[PDB]
């Protein structure tokens, strides 16, 4: 308030603070200086001697001499409001649009708690994306988490923001009134450059859909501390959507590489001994909790989708940061150079990629019947052809039988047109058709995974 | 002001006592000599002195007196054609007072105090102004060297001395505010002077290395990174920019790079001509060099001054190209403090700050309109050095995924003999789509298509490479060995320039562009050669291949027609055979 002053020992980003008692672990406070500017610092480690507060920013200028610290509030957090729904905000939760703040309806503890198991209701629903391939072969089901493993320089972001706007759940195909349920895309990146920061806002505003989405985006340079809380924000805000009003959310976090890069620093200073290959011991846990914001919960009808997209450095699937995820998130959708070099877009491979849970997706009495078998068609068909494309280099083409010679050509039409999709949006129904057509190229009575009926109605 | 003495001196760091009221990061003077200090930690009333130069020969109980300003280079007209120590001290004058030794106990001035200058004013007195509003234009070489309001000053004028020679120190503007503007103005380093606002970029930063201009390239606001082990050309690819970039100011600064590579640019650089005037090219040049050999802490100072210089010029209106030569040593330098002050570190012992002071740096600028309403660009292409070769190592990696435009410089490439060969199967730029407008119009209207087909072979070629090492080039037949060889030539001739061949070491687009169209053709017609019934085998051994060979060497003047001659030679030299 007025009060607690005579701060001794400040080295770099750490700070000890004289006798407080009031404080609590997980408190947050205003530091005030000799020039009126104010700074913030979280309450970590406290005793009967001192507490520990942590300069968020720079600390340029401070003094042994008095320059007090103001207790802000218990366990800080933020409220919410339906108002929020077309804004531009930074980290903590302040207006970056330039239009006055929110006005609550609630305050929300920002430790997100954990669910219960019984409460959760098994997924069974479907979601379109508007991208093709990631709906046809391996289909984002509803109330589902799933992540896009990118490479170092393959273009994640774009393949992000398309799948930002594009999606719209069609309940239509299942049967029920249309506007019984609306769609909320909740989006948060971080470690974004002045450059990146602009590619979003341009696309977002373009046709606009800001008016059905919430922003959160913690600049690159911005203090490393707030970074840590940043996602948890847009996660918890997501709750307030579906559980108190029903909605259908799509949360898309991004670049969780940053999430740990940034993480480490905190832990490295606040003390601990880092475990295996760095990445502070309690990662498993800490990472876990930023993914239990998902699934439908009986009775309640709305729910959360996670797609967090991140990049590896070692360009593997063995470095921990992604590997780890791959135990709790449930699938994998990679991007290869191969596609991308040849110039396609958005390059999402086939075969590396597969959503483990997707059976309770698409169905005969849920959203189109034949989809099942399309999915296991084009997959297994595909891989058969990608060998030939290499072995043709050793024996010429004068030694391919007829049936199989066609399985070469399949690949070309698949790769050139099918996984390319520029800016064209599509839909689950238009997409299944295309597929079919291409399959017609190879000889019939052979695609023996698929059942005869369907072929008798489509070709 | 605030003063105490040495308590504990041992290593580049010291702990004084009897001190309070200090502020974080503050210049000071320690020892009878006076040396330049920094406040980096406090503990009751004792403070860790960080001591910028050397040490040795000290006793406990010697002066320790702060002034309480926290670092800053004093910026104003006349700075080019010089060299500058880590706290911007002109070594010329130093050399003139020492001999041939960088000696402690030195104080001079940043901008020389003698020279007076031809003034011109703009605004009339009795007028209003706000922050960073232009005031006077003192001319300076081929440049026009404006002067601004120092940011965050606003008020109303009251007199203006008219034209004539005038001192640097002089107050040549008075205000009704009791304030005084003089030529220069001091500005911190830890801060980051604003601008009017942030904006997207789209103008290519030309560079003339075909490899940096047809494949990977850079936006004007560009940020990139160049790494490669020892002996890899790391330095020399920044040499070229320093003498063939396309902008107002090269501000080459390297920290921890040897003399030899610096001094050289101080004896060659006088006798050359810029692509933007005709004058001694050295006008667009900074050099704040601070070679490895010097002190410890200076290595930390060094960079952030040349970042600031990078703002300072932008500010006036120009087009900054800053490049730090070998920023990685900086990490090592930072971490040498650490060790002595006992901060537990994160992996590979770097103190956890790698991100902290990295990430602020690289984000800095590009195409940002100023307070003056000019188009300001900050172009940085950061050099780094790993210490292994394992790009897995933290300080390296942290660069990626903080900046775009990554170039990697392969190691095993270079041992053979090319330069500035890079792996393009490592590399990747991001900036490459928002360059399309400018390219279309400026260069050719069909260029990006014609380039993607080059990458069409080039990145696909590995497709075969692997199979070569699995069963030889043997039993790879003919659409096979077509490609292999095409591409063979593609890197043998479209990817290797020099920095020492007398000519041919700089190109315009339109020239380069040319080379590149040929090869496509050659591919095309070859494709139709084998399909028709003959074979590459002899085609390789055609004389016309070698013409495509040597090709790059002729200069521009000839270039049109050179290129036209092969444009005839193709269609005849296929159909015939
Ligand atoms: N463009 C070039 N033309 C000719 N030789 C080059 C070229 N680039 C590099 N080299 C040769 O290879 C060396 C590699 O550069 P070097 O100065 O060792 O770089 P660094 O040590 O900073 O990696 C050069 O010194 C030069 O001998």
Q: Phi, psi at residue A397, to the nearest 5°?
A: -110, 5
Ligand 1: which of B419, B500, B506, B507 to mutate, judged by most atoms within 8 Å of the beta carbon? B419
The reply to whether ligand 1 has any atom less than 6 angstroms from the CB of B233 is: yes
Instruction: Give A-chain residues touching B70 at CB under 8 angstroms.
Output: 60-61
Instruction: Give B-chain residues touching A201 at CB under 8 angstroms.
Output: none
Whether B316 and B148 have beta carbons less than 8 Å apart is answered as yes
Mutate to test the interface with B, among A18, A153, A315 (most CBs of B within 10 A): A153
Other Cβ atoms within 10 Å of A231 Cβ, number:
23
Mark yes or no for CB contact A193/B363 under 8 Å. yes
Residue among B302, B295, B301, B403 nearest B355 (CA): B403
Report the residue from A8, A195, A258 with minimal CB separation from B404: A195
Instruction: Give B-chain residues touching A386 at CB under 8 angstroms.
Output: none
Tell me the C-alpha distance between B315 and B147, whole Å: 9
The reply to whether ligand 1 has any atom less than 6 angstroms from the CB of B306 is: no
Residue among B1, B152, B208, B166 nearest B77 (CA): B166
Identify the sign of the CA torsion A424, A426, A432, A437. Answer: negative
Report the residue from A10, A221, A343 with minimal CB separation from B360: A221
Q: Distance, in angstroms, between B389 CA and closest chain A CA?
A: 13
The reply to whether ligand 1 has any atom less than 6 angstroms from the CB of B232 is: yes
DSSP assignment of B390-423: -TTSHHHHTTBTTB--B----HHHHHHS-SS---
Tell me the C-alpha distance between B201 and B220, whole Å: 6
Q: What is the dihedral of CA B466, B469, B472, B475, to 10 degrees?
A: -30
> Of all helices (H) and strands (E), which one includes residue B572?
helix B559-575
Q: C-alpha angle B367/B372/B378, rounded to 5°?
A: 25
Whether B183 and B221 have beta carbons less than 8 Å apart is answered as no
Residue among B340, B266, B263, B265 nearest B296 (CA): B340
Other Cβ atoms within 10 Å of B56 Cβ, number:
6
DSSP assignment of A182-236: -EEEEEEEEEE-TTHHHHHHHHHHHH--GGGEE--EEESSS-HHHHHHHHHHHHH
The reply to whether ligand 1 has any atom less than 6 angstroms from the CB of B48 is: no
Q: B472 CB near a chain A CB, below 8 Å?
A: no
Tell me the C-alpha distance between B479 and B158, whole Å: 80
Tell how far CA B192 is from the center of its chain: 18
Residues 213-232 of B with CB under 8 A from A: 219, 221, 223
Resolution in A: 4.7
Rounded distance from Cα B417 to ligand 1 centre (Å): 9
- Closest residue (by CA) to atom 27 of ligand 1? B233
> Of all helices (H) and strands (E), which one includes residue A149?
strand A148-150
Whether A256 and A145 have beta carbons less than 8 Å apart is answered as no
Q: C-alpha angle B96/B101/B102, rounded to 5°?
A: 90
Mark yes or no for CB contact A221/B223 under 8 Å. no
Tell me the C-alpha distance between B226 and B427, whole Å: 10
Rounded distance from Cα B412 to ligand 1 centre (Å): 14
Q: What are the counts of helices (DSSP H) followed by strands (DSSP E) for chain A?
A: 13, 20
Three-class SS of residue B293?
A: coil
The one-character DSSP state at A75 is: S
Tell me the C-alpha distance between A159 and A340, whole Å: 12
**Alpha helix ranges (H) inside A141-184:** 156-165
- Closest residue (by CA) to atom 24 of ligand 1? B233
The reply to whether ligand 1 has any atom less than 6 angstroms from the CB of B498 is: yes
Peptide-bond breaks in chain B following residues (C–N over 2.5 A): none
Tell me the C-alpha distance between A26 and A15, whole Å: 15
Tell me the C-alpha distance between A219 and A126, whole Å: 34
Q: B200 CB near a chain A CB, below 8 Å?
A: yes
Instruction: Give B-chain residues touching A59 at CB under 8 angstroms.
Output: 24
Q: Distance, in angstroms, between B485 CA and closest chain A CA?
A: 15
Three-class SS of residue A244?
A: helix
Length of chain B measured in residues: 577
Whether B314 and B376 have beta carbons less than 8 Å apart is answered as yes
Ligand 1: which of B210, B212, B233, B383 to mutate, judged by most atoms within 8 Å of the beta carbon? B233
Whether A361 and A126 have beta carbons less than 8 Å apart is answered as yes
Whether A194 and B200 have beta carbons less than 8 Å apart is answered as no
Tell me the C-alpha distance between B524 and B540, whole Å: 15
- Tokens at A277, concatenated: 């290959």
Tell me the C-alpha distance between B379 and B307, whole Å: 11
Whether B202 and B438 have beta carbons less than 8 Å apart is answered as yes
Count of alpha carbons within 13 Å of A132, Cβ hemisphere only? 23
Mark yes or no for CB contact A191/B345 under 8 Å. no
Q: Distance, in angstroms, between A221 CA and closest chain B CA?
A: 5
Other Cβ atoms within 10 Å of B558 Cβ, number:
11
Three-class SS of residue A147?
A: coil
Tell me the C-alpha distance between B378 and B218, whole Å: 12
Whether A141 and A123 have beta carbons less than 8 Å apart is answered as yes
Mutate to test the interface with B, among A56, A62, A64 (most CBs of B within 10 A): A64
Instruction: Give A-chain residues touching B378 at CB under 8 angstroms.
Output: none
- Tokens at B76, concatenated: 């104003």
Other Cβ atoms within 10 Å of B13 Cβ, number:
23
Mark yes or no for CB contact B70/A60 under 8 Å. yes
| Chain B residue with Cα closest to A18 | B44
Q: Which residue has the tokens 């053979």?
A: B416
Q: B334 CB near a chain A CB, below 8 Å?
A: no
Using the CB atoms, write b or e for B114-140: b if 16+ within 10 Å: eeebebebeeeeeeebeebbbbbbbeb
Mark yes or no for CB contact B23/A61 under 8 Å. yes
Q: Phi, psi at residue A237, to the nearest 5°?
A: -70, -35
Mutate to test the interface with B, among A197, A268, A270 (most CBs of B within 10 A): A268
Tell how far CA A174 is from the center of its chain: 27
The reply to whether ligand 1 has any atom less than 6 angstroms from the CB of B423 is: no
Mark yes or no for CB contact B70/A61 under 8 Å. yes
- Closest residue (by CA) to atom 13 of ligand 1? B233
Instruction: Give A-chain residues touching B50 at CB under 8 angstroms.
Output: none
- Tokens at B321, concatenated: 């190209």
* Beta bridge mates, A274: none
- Tokens at A95, concatenated: 């207006």
Report the residue from A64, A341, A343 with minimal CB separation from B45: A64
Report the residue from A58, A268, A341 with minimal CB separation from B352: A268
């Amino acid at each position: 308030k007025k009060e607690y002053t005579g701060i001794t020992y400040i080295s770099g980003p750490l700070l000890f603070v004289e006798n407080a008692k009031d404080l609590a672990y997980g408190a947050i406070v205003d530091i005030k200086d000799g020039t009126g500017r104010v700074r913030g610092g979280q309450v970590i480690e406290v005793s009967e001697e001192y507490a520990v507060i942590q300069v968020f920013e720079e600390t340029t200028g401070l003094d042994l001499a008095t320059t007090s610290v103001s207790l802000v509030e218990d366990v800080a957090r933020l409220g919410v409001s339906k108002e929020m729904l077309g804004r531009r905000f930074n980290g903590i939760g302040k207006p970056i649009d330039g239009l006055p703040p929110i006005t609550p309806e609630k305050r929300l503890p920002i430790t997100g708690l954990p669910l219960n198991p019984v409460a959760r209701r098994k997924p069974e629903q479907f979601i379109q994306t508007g991208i093709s391939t990631i709906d046809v072969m391996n289909t984002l089901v509803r109330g589902q988490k799933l992540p896009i493993f990118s490479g170092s320089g393959l273009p994640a972001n774009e393949i992000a923001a398309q799948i930002a706007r594009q999606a719209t759940v069609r309940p239509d195909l299942s049967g029920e009134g249309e506007k019984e349920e609306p769609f909320a895309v909740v989006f948060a990146a971080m470690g974004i450059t002045q450059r990146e920061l602009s590619y979003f806002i341009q696309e977002f505003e373009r046709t606009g859909a800001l008016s059905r989405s919430v922003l959160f985006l913690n600049k690159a340079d911005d203090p490393t501390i707030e970074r840590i809380l940043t996602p948890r924000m847009a996660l918890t805000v997501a709750e307030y959507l579906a559980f108190e009003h029903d909605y259908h959310v799509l949360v898309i976090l991004t670049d969780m590489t940053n999430y740990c890069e940034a993480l480490r620093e905190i832990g490295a200073a606040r003390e601990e001994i880092p475990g295996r290959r760095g990445y502070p011991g309690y990662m498993y846990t800490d990472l876990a909790t930023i993914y239990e914001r998902a699934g439908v919960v009986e009775g309640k009808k709305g729910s959360v989708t996670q797609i967090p997209i991140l990049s590896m450095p070692d360009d593997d699937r063995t470095h921990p940061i992604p590997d780890l995820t791959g135990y709790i998130t449930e699938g994998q959708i990679q991007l290869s150079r191969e596609l991308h070099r040849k110039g396609i877009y958005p390059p999402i491979d086939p075969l590396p990629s597969l959503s483990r849970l997707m059976n309770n997706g698409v169905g005969k009495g849920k959203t189109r019947e034949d989809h099942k078998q399309v999915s296991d068609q084009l997959y297994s068909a595909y891989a058969n052809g990608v060998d030939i494309r290499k072995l043709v280099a050793i024996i010429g083409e004068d030694a391919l039988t007829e049936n199989d010679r066609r399985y070469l050509q399949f690949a070309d039409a698949f790769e050139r047109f099918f996984i390319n999709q520029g800016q064209q949006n599509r839909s689950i129904e238009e997409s299944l058709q295309i597929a079919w057509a291409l399959l017609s190229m190879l000889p019939q009575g052979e695609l023996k995974r698929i059942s005869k009926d369907h072929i008798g109605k489509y070709y | 002001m605030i003063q105490g003495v040495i308590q504990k001196i041992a290593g580049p760091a010291v702990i004084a006592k009897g001190m309070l009221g200090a502020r974080m990061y503050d210049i000071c003077k320690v020892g009878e000599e006076g040396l330049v200090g920094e406040i980096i930690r406090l503990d009751g009333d004792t403070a860790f002195v960080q001591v910028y130069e050397d040490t040795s020969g000290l006793k406990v109980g010697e002066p320790v007196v702060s002034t309480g300003l926290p670092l800053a280079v004093e910026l104003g007209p006349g700075m080019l054609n010089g060299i500058y120590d880590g706290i911007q001290r002109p070594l010329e004058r130093i050399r003139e007072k020492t001999g041939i030794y960088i000696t402690r106990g030195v104080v001079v001035h940043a901008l020389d105090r003698e020279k007076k200058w031809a003034w011109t004013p703009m605004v009339k007195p009795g007028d209003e102004v706000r922050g960073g509003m232009v005031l006077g234009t003192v001319p300076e070489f081929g440049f026009t060297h404006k002067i601004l309001v120092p940011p965050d000053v606003r008020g109303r004028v009251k007199e203006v001395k008219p034209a004539g020679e005038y001192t640097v120190e002089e107050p040549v503007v008075v205000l009704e505010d009791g304030t005084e503007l003089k030529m220069y103005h001091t500005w911190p380093v830890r801060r980051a002077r604003p601008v009017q606002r942030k904006l997207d970029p789209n103008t290519p930063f030309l560079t003339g290395m075909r490899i940096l201009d047809v494949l990977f390239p850079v936006a004007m606001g560009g940020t990139a990174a160049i790494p490669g082990p020892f002996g890899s050309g790391k330095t020399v690819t920044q040499q070229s920019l320093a003498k063939w970039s396309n902008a107002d100011v090269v501000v080459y600064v390297g920290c921890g790079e040897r003399g030899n590579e610096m001094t050289d640019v101080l004896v060659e650089f006088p006798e050359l001509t810029d692509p933007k005037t005709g004058g001694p090219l050295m006008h667009r040049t900074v050099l704040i060099a601070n070679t490895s050999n010097m002190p410890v802490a200076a290595r930390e100072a060094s960079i952030y001054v040349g970042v600031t210089i990078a703002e300072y010029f932008r500010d006036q209106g120009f087009s900054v190209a800053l490049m730090a030569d070998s920023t990685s040593r900086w990490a090592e330098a930072l971490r040498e403090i650490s060790s002595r002050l006992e901060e537990m570190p994160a992996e590979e012992g770097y103190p956890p700050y790698l991100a902290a002071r990295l990430a602020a740096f690289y984000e800095r600028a590009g195409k940002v309109i100023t307070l003056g309403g000019e188009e300001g660009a900050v172009t940085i292409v950061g050099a780094v050095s790993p210490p292994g070769g394992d790009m897995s190592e933290p300080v390296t990696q942290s660069t990626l995924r903080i900046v775009g435009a990554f170039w990697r410089l392969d190691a095993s490439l270079a041992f053979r003999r090319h330069f500035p060969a890079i792996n393009w199967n490592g590399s990747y730029s991001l900036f490459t789509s928002a360059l399309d407008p400018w390219y279309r119009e400026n260069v050719a209207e069909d260029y990006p298509e014609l380039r993607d087909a080059i990458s069409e072979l080039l990145q696909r070629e590995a497709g075969l490479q692997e199979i070569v090492q699995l069963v030889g080039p043997d039993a790879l037949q003919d659409a096979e060995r077509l490609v292999i060889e095409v591409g063979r030539i593609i890197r043998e001739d479209f990817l290797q320039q020099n920095a020492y061949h007398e000519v041919d070491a700089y190109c315009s687009m339109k020239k380069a562009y040319g080379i590149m169209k040929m090869i496509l053709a050659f591919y095309k017609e070859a494709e139709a050669a084998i399909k028709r019934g003959v074979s590459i085998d002899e085609i390789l051994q055609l004389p016309v291949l070698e013409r495509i060979g040597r090709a790059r060497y002729v200069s521009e003047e000839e270039f049109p027609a050179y290129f036209e001659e092969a444009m005839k030679e193709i269609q005849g030299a296929f159909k015939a055979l």
